[PDB]
């Protein structure tokens, strides 16, 4: 398996990255991954109504809800190419090239994934729901001293 290697599109990635990550921090925030995935060219682009597509790529995240270009890359190319046991070669390969060929040792300590962050967000709401309920039950308690 060897799919559309649109190889002036791997480049089109970088331009649009630079639009979002000017300092070349290697990181963009979550609250922007939608806009980013969109404003690319048509193969790698993930058009709007975008959110749930993102959480499903299982993108790792690091402190401060940042995400790394090299995770975003493979994630987005995995989409345009189709999943396969042969991709597992692709990942560990596109990252060994990137690593030897990079003098920038950077902070890479992954916290969540875009998946967890979703289950995390609703579990918060469960706890947030019960405690708003309880708070009120409590306020009516205090109301009814008798």
């Amino acid at each position: 398996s060897t799919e559309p290697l649109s190889e002036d599109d791997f480049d089109m990635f970088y331009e649009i990255w630079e639009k979002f990550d000017p300092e070349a921090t290697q990181f963009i925030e979550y609250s922007v991954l939608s806009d980013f995935a969109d404003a690319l060219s048509e193969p790698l682009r993930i058009a709007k109504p975008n959110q749930i597509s993102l959480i499903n790529m299982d993108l790792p995240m690091v402190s401060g809800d940042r995400i790394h270009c090299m995770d975003i890359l493979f994630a987005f190319t995995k989409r345009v190419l189709g999943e396969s046991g042969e991709m597992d070669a692709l990942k560990i390969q596109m990252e060994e090239k990137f690593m030897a060929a990079n003098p920038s040792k950077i902070s890479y300590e992954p916290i969540t994934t875009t998946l967890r962050r979703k289950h995390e967000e609703v579990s918060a709401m469960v706890i947030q729901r019960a405690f708003r309920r309880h708070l009120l039950q409590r306020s009516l308690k205090h109301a009814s001293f008798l």
Partner: protein
């Protein structure tokens, strides 16, 4: 009773997984569609859901078949089994204790966010022992009587 602008979102999730375009998702996806939507579905809850809508063994859930399902989940008030799981998601080390700091973090930054002053009262209540470390199972039992 009725759902909301979250129909916008259920549509999004459903639409993504329907690669064919027949407006019906293959039932083994159902479990995947929902994990992508934030919910926790057991292979049991799946089965009961699956054969309580698809009683005709076709493997079909069209979008109405689906929107009514969620309407039945949202509908109910969360359990205590569920407030338990939800807390356990945030006790990453796995010891039954969560810090009044990590709590306050999660609580003030995820979901229907709690204001600084609500969380204050949450901690006053959950941390009886002043050590800023709360046994959440102990806290569940506090908001259940």
């Amino acid at each position: 009773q009725l759902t909301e602008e979250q129909i916008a979102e259920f549509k999004e999730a459903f639409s993504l997984f329907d690669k064919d375009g027949d407006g019906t998702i293959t039932t083994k996806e159902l479990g995947t569609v929902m994990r992508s939507l934030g919910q926790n579905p057991t292979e049991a809850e799946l089965q009961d859901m699956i054969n309580e809508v698809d009683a005709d063994g076709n493997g079909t859930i069209d979008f109405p078949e689906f929107l009514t399902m969620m309407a039945r989940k949202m509908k109910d008030t969360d359990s205590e089994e569920e407030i338990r799981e939800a807390f356990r998601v945030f006790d990453k080390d796995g010891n039954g204790y969560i810090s009044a700091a990590e709590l306050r973090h999660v609580m003030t930054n995820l979901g229907e966010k709690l204001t600084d002053e609500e969380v204050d009262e949450m901690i006053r209540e959950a941390d009886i022992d002043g050590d800023g470390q709360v046994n959440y199972e102990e806290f569940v039992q506090m908001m259940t009587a």
